Amino acid sequence: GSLTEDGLSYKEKFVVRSYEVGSNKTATVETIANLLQEVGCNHAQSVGFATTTTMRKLHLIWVTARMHIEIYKYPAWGDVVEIETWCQSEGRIGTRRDWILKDSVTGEVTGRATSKWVMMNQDTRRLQKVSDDVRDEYLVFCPQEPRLAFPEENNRSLKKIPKLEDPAQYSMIGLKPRRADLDMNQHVNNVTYIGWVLESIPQEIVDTHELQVITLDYRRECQQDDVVDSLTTTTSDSQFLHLLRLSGDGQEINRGTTLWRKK
Amino acid sequence: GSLTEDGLSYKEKFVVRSYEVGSNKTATVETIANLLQEVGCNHAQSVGFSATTTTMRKLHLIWVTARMHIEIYKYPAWGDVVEIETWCQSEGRIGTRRDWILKDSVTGEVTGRATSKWVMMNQDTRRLQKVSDDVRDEYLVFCPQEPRLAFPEENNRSLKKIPKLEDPAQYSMIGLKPRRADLDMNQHVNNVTYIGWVLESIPQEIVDTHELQVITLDYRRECQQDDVVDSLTTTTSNDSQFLHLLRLSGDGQEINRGTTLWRKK
Numbered sequence A: 001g002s003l004t005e006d007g008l009s010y011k012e013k014f015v016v017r018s019y020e021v022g023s024n025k026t027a028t029v030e031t032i033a034n035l036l037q038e039v040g041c042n043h044a045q046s047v048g049f050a051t052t053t054t055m056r057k058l059h060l061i062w063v064t065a066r067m068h069i070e071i072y073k074y075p076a077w078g079d080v081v082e083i084e085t086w087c088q089s090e091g092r093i094g095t096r097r098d099w100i101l102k103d104s105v106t107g108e109v110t111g112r113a114t115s116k117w118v119m120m121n122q123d124t125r126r127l128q129k130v131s132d133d134v135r136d137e138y139l140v141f142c143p144q145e146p147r148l149a150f151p152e153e154n155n156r157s158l159k160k161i162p163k164l165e166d167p168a169q170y171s172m173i174g175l176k177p178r179r180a181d182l183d184m185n186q187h188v189n190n191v192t193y194i195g196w197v198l199e200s201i202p203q204e205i206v207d208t209h210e211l212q213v214i215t216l217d218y219r220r221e222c223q224q225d226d227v228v229d230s231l232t233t234t235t236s237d238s239q240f241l242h243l244l245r246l247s248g249d250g251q252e253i254n255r256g257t258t259l260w261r262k263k
Numbered sequence B: 001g002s003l004t005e006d007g008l009s010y011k012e013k014f015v016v017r018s019y020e021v022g023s024n025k026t027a028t029v030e031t032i033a034n035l036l037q038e039v040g041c042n043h044a045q046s047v048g049f050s051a052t053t054t055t056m057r058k059l060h061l062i063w064v065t066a067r068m069h070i071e072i073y074k075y076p077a078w079g080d081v082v083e084i085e086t087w088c089q090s091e092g093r094i095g096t097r098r099d100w101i102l103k104d105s106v107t108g109e110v111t112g113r114a115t116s117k118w119v120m121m122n123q124d125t126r127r128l129q130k131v132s133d134d135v136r137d138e139y140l141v142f143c144p145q146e147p148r149l150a151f152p153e154e155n156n157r158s159l160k161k162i163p164k165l166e167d168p169a170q171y172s173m174i175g176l177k178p179r180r181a182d183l184d185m186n187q188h189v190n191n192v193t194y195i196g197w198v199l200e201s202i203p204q205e206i207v208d209t210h211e212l213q214v215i216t217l218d219y220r221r222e223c224q225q226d227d228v229v230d231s232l233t234t235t236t237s238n239d240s241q242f243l244h245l246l247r248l249s250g251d252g253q254e255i256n257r258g259t260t261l262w263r264k265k
């Protein structure tokens, strides 16, 4: 992988692996989300990091508030996918990381993704606005004119998501993370939550449809000793409303929506 | 990746990913096992497979793992390049063996080795059978004919008999179940998931103070998509050794048994 000519974005190519594909012999949405995360990490590394030196002193970190992914074509096993990523400052609200997925052979856009990030103290877990000091250190690595993976007005990446009401139409209960679900800092990897959301989608939908769009809001993290219930209700293509909550007290950890296209 | 000059083995390089590493910023044993599986798949593809031979597909026969043995001396760090060489060997009518050698691409030193025993099974009845001559002839042209062992040694750990853990277990992790990411393209539980489930009953204190050096796993029965598993461990022991058992949560039907050896950091 490498930074582009202007040094304001990063590209990397990936060969889709045998264990990364589902029943259709194409990459799962979890494989795609892991690849987006990997190219974001390589981008941060290439420009010197995604914590700045002043964030490290103040015990501040970037946390995902929302992830939105749209896939037109999932790459097949053995195919090469090229992913371009970049970051943008959204004033004192936080930052945004965007991605464009392309088929390396044709050059066509096969997918796009966007994510909203907020600044949090690692210890108290309290959200803070972005200070000028931190903003100035990040801006030299971002394009200053707008660059949006989802430019369109009233697009699906910025839609408000409601809270699923009991009883849910479908459910998968007692979900718990194992060591492979954790990142290097022993926190549950963000991609695991996408997997848990999808566990309450019936197998008949997965067998007859392809997932086209997924929007996920992250409210609270699942700890290593927590147990999660995944709830889904059809709102309609087929659209669903989703809710992840702790198995015991019913504390919300995530909410989202999915849109599926008939094969 | 590519077949070597003689066409009897296959090599591939991998850059260790951010999500593939544990707390030490080095690859997990599950990442290593996924990479071994990936290089085995690429080897089969390079020599014409899609690893079912012509006679196997008409007879509804497949290769299934009976045992997996992995020894790691050094886990590659995040961003490091690991080179893996793999090859197959016929073991007469018993079945086949796939071996691997892991190397640090910069130094060329051997950082790990693995071996696996495979048996022929009818896909539908699940009945094991010996390898026929017609099938054996079809895969011998892709294997070295003189012995080539990742584990040569006379009393090596890869061929040791594993006993059945007796109740009560010292440690346990109950109610483990697969999610869609744990399945392969054929909707069967991926073999690597079982390694993860075995490791779930190892205490976090062992994981924090030791590195896993050796793992031997016997596969007895598969976990179906609607099954629930209990992972059991008892210490059998500088180094710490454990005896492992995976069984179905309900009737206690054995699915796997194994051993692990851990060395103090």
Ligand SMILES: NS(=O)(=O)c1nc2ccccc2[nH]1
Binding pocket: A061, A063, A064, A122, A123, A185, A187, A188, A221
């Ligand atoms: N909320 S989180 O993204 O799961 C998270 N919180 C964290 C605190 C310290 C270090 C890493 C963290 N990752």
Ligand SMILES: NS(=O)(=O)c1nc2ccccc2[nH]1
Binding pocket: A177, A178, A179, A180, A181, A182, A223, A224, A225, B173, B200, B201, B202, B203, B204
């Ligand atoms: N973080 S976890 O993957 O949920 C986890 N923590 C563990 C501590 C001890 C034993 C098993 C464990 N599994």
Ligand SMILES: NS(=O)(=O)c1nc2ccccc2[nH]1
Binding pocket: B062, B064, B065, B123, B186, B188, B189, B222
């Ligand atoms: N026993 S197994 O390795 O989980 C397995 N059985 C199978 C039957 C048909 C197709 C793939 C399979 N994988």
Ligand SMILES: NS(=O)(=O)c1nc2ccccc2[nH]1
Binding pocket: A172, A199, A200, A201, A202, A203, B177, B178, B179, B180, B181, B183, B224, B225, B226
């Ligand atoms: N155990 S699994 O094969 O990952 C799985 N999860 C499921 C959720 C809903 C319907 C069928 C499922 N199969």
